[PDB]
Amino acid sequence: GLMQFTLPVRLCKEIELFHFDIGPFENMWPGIFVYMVHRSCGTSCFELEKLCRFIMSVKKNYRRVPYHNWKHAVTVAHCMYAILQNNHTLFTDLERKGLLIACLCHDLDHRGFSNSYLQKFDHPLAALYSTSTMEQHHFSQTVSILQLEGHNIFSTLSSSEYEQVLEIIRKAIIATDLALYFGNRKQLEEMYQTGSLNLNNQSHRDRVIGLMMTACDLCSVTKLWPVTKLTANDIYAEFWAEGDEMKKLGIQPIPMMDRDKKDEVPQGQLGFYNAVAIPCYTTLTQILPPTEPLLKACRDNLSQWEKVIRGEE
Ligand SMILES: O=C(O)c1nc(C2CC2)cnc1Nc1cncnc1
Ligand SMILES: [Mg+2]
Ligand SMILES: [Zn+2]
């Protein structure tokens, strides 16, 4: 129990900041995650032997896709870490445990295709789960891994604590379905403004955890410009493949997915920042003020995309 993960000095310092990039050395990402669990949660939260076996099984069940891959999983978990570390007293013991695990598992077994494509293809997952198709799959895969011999990192919780943490994880993973974020954020906006927001109301905390999940999930737009811009290529490599697969079902895809309309990307990023990212981080910052560096970094990246359109890069 006296075995800490320690990082080199640069990483030990930058890991605390919202804009930390986990680096290109895949072999360091498990250690980076255990480091975050230890500081967020404690060295006691999980049996190290069980946690390492859980992490490696989660890693194996992420595929080799350009964006929805193991690096995304760890990156999203790091944003959650930075949120929890800057909001120390707002969250329960169980919540800290549940949310880092939910972020690590939230895109398990992703194939690089949207819920929409699965439904037009008539994928069996679309018959099994008619809404939030991939997200109910990601939660399914999380439960499957937790039930492997040796992989139950929660085994030392009481029965009722075990049911509560799995319910935190299920709601957190379902909330990463962006179709649900629009109405979740509108409701949090009304509640914060009329002043009815109450973090002791469970249904309210649920909504706030959902928004934290959207914020961590989108956190590649809150990095320094060179990171955000190089990540945007990874996300468009998936979108353009999905577009090709739409054309193979005889369906003109949306322009966001059409590789023949690469010129329209800068304007599509503006729409995404203005309709999704900026409002997400604004409402998050209103509810949890120390998350403001995410909103500041998002606004800087919006201004960089505006510079791309004005031909200045
Ligand atoms: O551009 C987008 O439409 C986009 N959409 C989603 C969500 C649908 C999966 C995530 N991120 C996105 N943009 C993005 C930019 N730069 C870096 N990482 C993501
Ligand atoms: Mg997802
Ligand atoms: Zn994701």
Swiss-Prot record:
<feature type="binding site">
    <location>
        <position position="68"/>
    </location>
    <ligand>
        <name>3',5'-cyclic AMP</name>
    </ligand>
</feature>
<feature type="binding site">
    <location>
        <position position="106"/>
    </location>
    <ligand>
        <name>a divalent metal cation 1</name>
    </ligand>
</feature>
<feature type="binding site">
    <location>
        <position position="68"/>
    </location>
    <ligand>
        <name>3',5'-cyclic GMP</name>
    </ligand>
</feature>
<feature type="domain" description="PDEase">
    <location>
        <begin position="1"/>
        <end position="312"/>
    </location>
</feature>
<feature type="binding site">
    <location>
        <position position="217"/>
    </location>
    <ligand>
        <name>a divalent metal cation 1</name>
    </ligand>
</feature>
<feature type="active site" description="Proton donor">
    <location>
        <position position="68"/>
    </location>
</feature>
<feature type="binding site">
    <location>
        <position position="107"/>
    </location>
    <ligand>
        <name>a divalent metal cation 1</name>
    </ligand>
</feature>
<feature type="binding site">
    <location>
        <position position="72"/>
    </location>
    <ligand>
        <name>a divalent metal cation 1</name>
    </ligand>
</feature>
<protein>
    <recommendedName>
        <fullName>cAMP and cAMP-inhibited cGMP 3',5'-cyclic phosphodiesterase 10A</fullName>
    </recommendedName>
</protein>
<comment type="similarity">
    <text>Belongs to the cyclic nucleotide phosphodiesterase family.</text>
</comment>
<comment type="subunit">
    <text>Homodimer.</text>
</comment>
<feature type="binding site">
    <location>
        <position position="269"/>
    </location>
    <ligand>
        <name>3',5'-cyclic AMP</name>
    </ligand>
</feature>
<feature type="binding site">
    <location>
        <position position="269"/>
    </location>
    <ligand>
        <name>3',5'-cyclic GMP</name>
    </ligand>
</feature>
<comment type="function">
    <text>Plays a role in signal transduction by regulating the intracellular concentration of cyclic nucleotides. Can hydrolyze both cAMP and cGMP, but has higher affinity for cAMP and is more efficient with cAMP as substrate. May play a critical role in regulating cAMP and cGMP levels in the striatum, a region of the brain that contributes to the control of movement and cognition.</text>
</comment>
<feature type="binding site">
    <location>
        <position position="107"/>
    </location>
    <ligand>
        <name>a divalent metal cation 2</name>
    </ligand>
</feature>
